[PDB]
Symmetry: C2
Subunit: 223 residues, 2 copies
């Protein structure tokens, strides 16, 4: 197939609608107030530890980052809207976009308390992965995080990304060394992942308290 390979399309500012979550292209006027709220919760400092940004101290102080992020084409930012509340719950981006080789990254992730460790967060990831493979036809979908960011590494593994390696001294972030852990999902890996996510996200998989009956790793194991 690869002798005829040509560049794939660039990602677009599209709306993505799921059962638990909605993704909207980030817009300062539409999302600014609620994203500020999400980004300035009581434990925002802890939540932002490994991110490139620090939490905004005031709404006015948030505006410059918000405007740059809303206008940016790479990273391409989306607000993550929790459907149950209708509120912006976080943000994420498609980034390091390489249409020529069909390679792209999900990064710039902040999933706040409304969605963190709930089905909405898993579906936010899923909707990007689905778009990247089924619509854009990319070959390689990346996750990178600080190697010391345990929750992010475990999130990547749970999501089905495969570890590739650690770039030693890859960055300096907030006055500290960052070795970067890299993981990927290949186009050949996507179809089995898609089935496992769809099974996990199904309303059948959540009891009346909203608690999962089986985990995402369990469904992936089941094949």
């Amino acid at each position: 197939d690869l002798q005829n390979w040509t560049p794939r399309p660039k990602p677009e500012r599209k709306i993505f609608e799921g059962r638990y979550v909605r993704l909207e292209p980030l817009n300062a006027q539409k999302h600014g107030d609620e994203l500020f709220a999400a980004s300035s919760v009581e434990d925002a400092e802890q939540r932002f530890t490994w991110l490139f940004e620090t939490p905004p101290a005031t709404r006015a102080e948030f505006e410059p980052w918000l405007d740059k992020a809303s206008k940016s084409d790479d990273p391409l930012f989306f607000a993550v809207i929790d459907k149950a509340s209708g509120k912006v719950a976080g943000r994420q981006a498609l980034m390091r976009i390489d249409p020529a080789n069909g390679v792209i990254e999900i990064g710039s992730i902040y999933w706040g308390p409304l969605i963190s460790r709930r089905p909405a967060a898993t579906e936010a990831q899923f909707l990007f992965m689905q778009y990247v493979f089924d619509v854009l036809g990319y070959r390689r979908y990346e996750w990178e995080c600080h190697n010391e960011n345990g929750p992010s590494r475990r999130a990547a593994e749970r999501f089905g990304f495969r570890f590739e390696g650690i770039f030693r001294q890859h960055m300096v972030v907030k006055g500290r060394n960052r070795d970067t852990a890299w993981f990927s999902v290949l186009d050949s890996e996507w179809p089995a992942l898609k089935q496992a996510y769809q099974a996990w996200l199904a309303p059948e998989n959540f009891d009346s308290a909203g608690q999962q009956k089986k985990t995402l790793q369990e469904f992936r194991d089941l094949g």
Copy 2:
């Protein structure tokens, strides 16, 4: 790293060694000699894993040469073999990250005047010294096609440490490329510098031009 700042960008300057001289690539100055070196009998084998194909004619070489001469990233240098006096190959500093002090040595073409001779090792050394002792960078990268055995071996010999393979990283010349990644850290450089100095010293080569000890032997010390 509380005090860490962005580092300077690399600049077009001349780097003068014992065996090799690196000059900022210039179409008029280097084009005819570099084309000659790039159209040697085994140019096809030498270009296999490069992004470029070997140039069939001087005219057909001009677009790549002009673009490479003007490029700021990759930032290209002609590799002049001092003994012969000829342009013998080319190489670049690339994927320049001043904020984090990360940079790659890449787009390496070393022709038969210097490949597997001390000049090639020195060509690598002069970039490595510039990156660490002058620019103050903290991570120096090498990447290649995973099936490029000679490049993987060269990176390991030169002291770069394997970090991993990016699967399906590129499509190159109609085929899949998984990319193998290697690095040298600033913390590793002072000891590595000494090993290169020992290896490149004239005293390490006998009257027949053969090394007495290998680069890897000096690195073990």
